[PDB]
Design a protein around this nucleic acid. Structure first.
Lengths: 96, 76, 64, 52
RNA sequence: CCAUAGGUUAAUGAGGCGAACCGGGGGAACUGAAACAUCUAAGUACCCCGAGGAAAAGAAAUCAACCGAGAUUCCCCCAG
RNA sequence: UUUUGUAUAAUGGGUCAGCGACUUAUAUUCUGUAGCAAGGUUAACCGAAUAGGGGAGCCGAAGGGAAACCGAGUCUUAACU
RNA sequence: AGGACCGAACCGACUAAUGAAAAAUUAGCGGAUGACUUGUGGCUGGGGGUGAAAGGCCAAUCAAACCGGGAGAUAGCU
RNA sequence: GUAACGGGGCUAAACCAUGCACCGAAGCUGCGGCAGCGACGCUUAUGCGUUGUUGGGUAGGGGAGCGUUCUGUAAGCCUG
RNA sequence: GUUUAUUAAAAACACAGCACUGUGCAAACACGAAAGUGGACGUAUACGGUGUGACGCCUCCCGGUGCCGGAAGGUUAAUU
RNA sequence: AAUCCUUGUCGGGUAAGUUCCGACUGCACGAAUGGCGUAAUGAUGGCCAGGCUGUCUCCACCCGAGACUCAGUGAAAUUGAACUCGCUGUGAGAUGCAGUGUACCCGCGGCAAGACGGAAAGACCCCGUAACCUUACUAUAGCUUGACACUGAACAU
RNA sequence: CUUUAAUGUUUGAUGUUCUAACGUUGACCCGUAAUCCGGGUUGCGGACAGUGUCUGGUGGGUAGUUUGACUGGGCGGUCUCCUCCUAAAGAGUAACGGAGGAGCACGAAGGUUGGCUAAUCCUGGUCGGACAUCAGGAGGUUAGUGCAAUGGCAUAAGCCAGCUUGACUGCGAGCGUGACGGCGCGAGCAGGUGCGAAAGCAGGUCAUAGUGAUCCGGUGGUUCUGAAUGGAAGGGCCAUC
């Protein structure tokens, strides 16, 4: 980023925004990844056990991505609307 | 000397010529005064910038008693 | 050793889905009352980096 | 740049204000214009105040 | 005045040398920043003291997060 | 060699022989190639052991927003044709 | 008597012409009892010394000695 | 040092006009050869009949090779 | 008298003399993180600093910048 | 004058004096970064005269040491390669190009016009974002101010 | 509350004396064969002096540095923006080429509705005159435009008057223009306004100059965030300096 002595592009432009420390502990779960766990029940712990999310993860959503076929009991987690519908179709249960 | 100065060139002038198809919004002329005047379906901006108000073909024409240049858009 | 990021570059840019880079416009910080509102409005939203200076940005930001 | 600048403040009770210039020598009296408040989304009177 | 300082003997130990590593006491500038003063170089180079076969550290007035871990040291990640 | 331009009276070389200058390490990207493929791959280490274990991690399979958050959408805005 | 005079040694170095010599030669030249000269030993150390001062001298080196180290300083130059 | 046709020399071997010859280059053509890039079509050893066309080159980009020392192949093979 | 050892010996330096100024002795000042040492085993007829430079005849401006003295007011640190 | 104009003007000195000496609009003398004098002194600067002279008119001869030849020993700088001429042009000053002229091969003693000769990566000049040397900036040793500490007791205003 | 007096107690500072810290480079004694040093006695001084930490001043004594570029080197001049010409009839185009301006102004000098039309000259007319104001005419923009120049402007963009705040908030098809940063034009959509009977016009001003990136902060709003939790601080986002 040296442009002769002209003031370089980065320094031209603003800093903006801030880092969220809460973002680093949230997680995003495909529907495909619901089968990877064992027991057919999906807690944060189970996913971590299944090396799906990671250890320092307090929160995790299920997104409509991929597809889920087996019935799954989704527990203690956020689900998008489309993901939720998909789960219902598969024959699954959702609970907070 | 006392003379080194000049201004940056403004790149005025006709942008689209006779029988150019244009999209609505497109600028036909940049000018200082109303050298060209707005005709049918051509708008005049605050800096006298003539621009297409509709999609069609540019159409230069002289009109009126003063014999003034008028840019219109032919329908397309 | 690992490549070190240009931290200021990191601060000022964010990568997009297609490997682009968004960035906030200049000229919308202070002297403002003289600036017309329209101009201000347009500046507000984030903007993608141009093709010409894209490469410099990448170089600054290897880990994106 | 003798013509100094001010901020017209919304009488709606919102924080919202406009900013502008005025010549305080020739015009001592305060500027009061009826301008659009976008928080209330109505046209309200705005009274001059010091920019600070 | 008593004492103490001092003095003469006796015993025990030390002293000096040595590659690097280790702990402590002091501590640059060139250089980079396309100049330069904050900053960097770098607690580096160097000087000094001390030790050991290793040294230092070390047994929570520590982390953690409302679950828990359980002194120090070292390696890979975390993460440019 | 350097130059717009050198027989140049611009530089260098007395000659021979020997030596004499784009490396290496670690990161990152792109290209080729091989492997496997919505998966790919292990690091330290254990293992006298180039095997095998070791998946801690990393990259990818989702993005939008400063962020909360939402999520094939999202941000904007009171709301978007 | 004398920082007195002329003048050898001794100390210097104004003019001149000319490698044996990294400052000499020959011919002349100044001082030559003094603020003189000289032997031996000693002390002052580098932004420091010493300097009747010229930025002079400090080991044929001085507007900051030499040796080693930072060090392969840096070199948009050749 | 002739030294203001390159010289000799020229009264045309000068100049103008018209014409027909010839010389004249690494240009074009002729014969032989190599290579690049495209077309189509073979029927293949992934290149071949061909068929067009291209092939001056600094910075520089891309492509393909020669040779040297050493490791394996190699207790092999060559060598008094 | 001294001086650029090795292109400058002079009108340059020094000089006796003059003047200003500091310094009361644990002097001023100087070398020293300090201890201490020089000054000086001296004591204002002495020592230090600065300029001038035998001898003779001599030698307006305090606004500026310095120094010395003053402290009524203004402003003013740490501290509180 | 240790004064631009300037070789100022006048006088002296000389046949002739931008110098020297004496006098008369200080570009831009001047009183201890001293003024004006000053006997003596000076390898001090300037000018004039006497004497002397090869300094010169204008060189001649001679004596020695080299140079030259013989024998012995035996360097150096420099060097792209050379079969290494003149002229006029060309190419920006030609041994090497064009045209032309001249010229048998090779030494020795001499000279120095050229080989942009040798010597030192010009010292002048410029450039580049080193070194030493004020009322530039920033610091700082030192000197100095106060506050607290080492540091206490009375008495008065 | 203005203003003081009384009794009780409380910091601040001001000198006078003291003697016990501290000083002694005064004297004598001892360690001691000793001008060091220490101890002892004593005199003088004395809570000063002097040292540490903090603090203001001074500080080329010393150190680290800086001291622009263009330029037919320095000196002089210039450095951003606007207009014209050079510029070769699209755009763009250099010179230490030729000529001039800007670093603002205006709550009306903006919006809209309604209305109007200039300079100059001539003739007549009190003071009144080359030049005020008033009549009649010629003229036809030679004038005006807040300010340079250009291009515009009568459907006026020039001049008067009435009512007003569109000198709005969110956006924006599509263009122009730049290496980029950026700058510019913009119909239309939503909300809410003003003028108009209405059609409509209004997102500043006839247009082109009146300007400054980023960082660092400042102010107001905003629960977006909030390092155990609830808050807060700080940060973010919007507006603005």
């Amino acid at each position: 980023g040296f442009e002769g002595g002209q003031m370089p592009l980065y320094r031209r432009l603003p800093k903006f925004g801030f880092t969220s420390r809460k973002a680093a502990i949230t997680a995003e779960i495909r529907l495909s990844d619901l089968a990877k766990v064992e027991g057919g029940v999906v807690d944060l712990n189970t996913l971590k056990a299944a090396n799906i999310i990671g250890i320092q993860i307090e929160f995790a959503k299920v997104i409509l991505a991929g597809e889920v076929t087996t019935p799954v009991t989704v527990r203690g987690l956020r689900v998008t609307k489309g993901a939720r519908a998909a789960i219902e179709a598969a024959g699954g249960k959702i609970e907070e | 000397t006392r003379n080194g100065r000049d201004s940056e060139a403004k790149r005025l002038g006709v942008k689209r010529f006779g029988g150019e198809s244009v999209l609505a919004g497109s600028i036909i002329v940049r000018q200082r005064g109303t050298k060209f005047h707005a005709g049918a379906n051509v708008g005049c901006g605050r800096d006298h910038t003539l621009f297409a108000k509709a999609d069609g073909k540019v159409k230069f024409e002289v009109k009126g008693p003063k014999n003034r240049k008028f840019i219109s858009i032919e329908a397309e | 050793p690992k490549i070190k990021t240009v931290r200021g570059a990191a601060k000022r840019f964010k990568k997009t889905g297609k490997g682009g880079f968004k960035h906030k416009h200049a000229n919308l910080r202070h002297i403002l009352t003289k600036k017309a509102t329209k101009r201000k409005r347009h500046l507000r939203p984030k903007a993608m980096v141009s093709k010409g200076d894209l490469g410099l940005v990448i170089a600054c930001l290897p880990y994106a | 740049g003798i013509r100094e600048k001010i901020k017209l403040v919304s009488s709606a009770g919102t924080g919202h204000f406009y900013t502008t210039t005025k010549n305080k020598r020739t015009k001592p009296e305060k500027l009061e214009l009826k301008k659009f408040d976008p928080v209330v989304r109505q046209h309200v009177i705005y009274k001059e105040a010091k920019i600070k």
